[PDB]
Homo-oligomer: A and B are copies of this chain.
Amino acid sequence: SHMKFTVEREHLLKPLQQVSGPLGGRPTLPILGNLLLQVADGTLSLTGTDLEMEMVARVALVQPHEPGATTVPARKFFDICRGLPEGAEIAVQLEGERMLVRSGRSRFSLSTLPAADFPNLDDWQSEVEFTLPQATMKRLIEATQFSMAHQDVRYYLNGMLFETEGEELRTVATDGHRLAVCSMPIGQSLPSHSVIVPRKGVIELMRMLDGGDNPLRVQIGSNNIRAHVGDFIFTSKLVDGRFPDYRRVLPKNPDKHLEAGCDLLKQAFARAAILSNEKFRGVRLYVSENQLKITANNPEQEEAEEILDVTYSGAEMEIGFNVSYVLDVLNALKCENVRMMLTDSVSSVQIEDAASQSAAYVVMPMRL
């Protein structure tokens, strides 16, 4: 191939870092360990992929260049660029099946694989499109991502529901024990639609949101989702499956409302957790007039007890929880006071920020 370019080190590092995101992590096919490099019309494009998602970065070429393409080992190429001195100019060209990298008195010959072999995601058509602030997308994912399933047999929970309704973008994540849902206004009228993004793609979308006054442009097809921020384009296949309806898992008539300081509540659960069962992490809540008591004990018969002043006037009751599920919610709620809505010992609890209803969390209890 004719491909040639020379680019300063600092223009390459962040793109190489971003497009390497989808790469593992248990090799599969050798070309999947390579980045696709393409030069055309004064632009260098870099692509990495795991066959399910891909990340693309564009770099402007202001120095002499020649069009072409190849694929190169991502970790070796990244380390070469990162290892060169600050300010270095990195010259690249192909000689036969080898990629030559030269900077000053450093020279490297890398083995390549043909660009024609690189599995890039196939052509697909956009059906829903909108723009939103990156901070909004970031808040929506951060607010729910921890409740996603991981390696669950119900493959449709190993991901996150993205749902457009009215003026809102909504995310839902659940593993069948706990659920998180967050809605944010988008300031544009959208069709009613919902897709499942795989959890690995959710994570990389979250890690691409860095920059400043750049907006985030989203395109959703029938089988794919695409996000454009600045010079980076993320694309992922969608999960083909039916997602549970968060509207139906919400507690239907909670008659007991507790309100408490988020920091003090989180710290009491964290300390009680220390003497909980290491495998099951069960803790026990007793609520009474303006009082909350958290207890925990383990197979060695050790015991923790925490008492907190809360705002509660409902009937006294006792309920068990996996303390990690509760602490995930309270760590996600970066707020002053949380509200807990309860029904009985065998029913789900809904947890939210006492001052905001944009996010809600539902956690199923444990049999005490």
- Taking beta carbons and an 8 Å cutoff, which residues of A are in contact with B? 76, 79-80, 83-85, 98, 105-111, 267-268, 270-271, 274-275, 300-308
Contacts and interface: CB of A to CB of B under 8 A. Distances in A.
**How many copies of the polypeptide does the oligomer hold?**
2
A6 to B, nearest CB: 18
B304 A108 contact: yes
A103 to B, nearest CB: 9
A84 B274 CA distance: 12
Interface centre among A98, A274, A301, A306 (most CB of B within 10 A): A274
Contacts of A80: 271, 274
A105 B306 contact: yes
Given A76-B274, A84-B271, A108-B302, 10 more contacts: A76-B275, A76-B302, A83-B270, A98-B302, A107-B304, A107-B305, A109-B275, A109-B304, A110-B275, A111-B302
Contacts of A307: 105-106
Contacts of A267: 83, 85
Nearest to A270: B83
Query: Nearest 8 A-B pairs (CB), nearest first?
Result: A105-B307, A83-B271, A107-B305, A109-B303, A79-B274, A111-B300, A108-B304, A106-B306
Contacts of A98: 302
Nearest to A83: B271
Contact of A110 (B85, B111, B302, B308): B302
Contacts of A305: 106-108
A303 B79 CA distance: 14
Contacts of A106: 268, 271, 304-307
A74 to B, nearest CB: 12
Given A83-B271, A85-B267, A267-B85, A108 B303 contact: yes
Contacts of A268: 106
A169 B105 CA distance: 42
Contacts of A303: 108-109
Contacts of A85: 267
B270 A111 contact: no
Nearest to A84: B271
5 contacts: A105-B308, A106-B304, A107-B305, A108-B304, A111-B302
A224 to B, nearest CB: 34
A335 B80 CA distance: 24
Contacts of A302: 76, 98, 108-111
A106 B98 CA distance: 66
Contacts of A108: 271, 274-275, 302-305
Nearest to A103: B271
A111 B274 CA distance: 13
Contacts of A105: 306-308
**Which of A98, A275, A301 lies at the interface centre, i.e. has the most chain B CB atoms within 10 A of its CB?**
A275
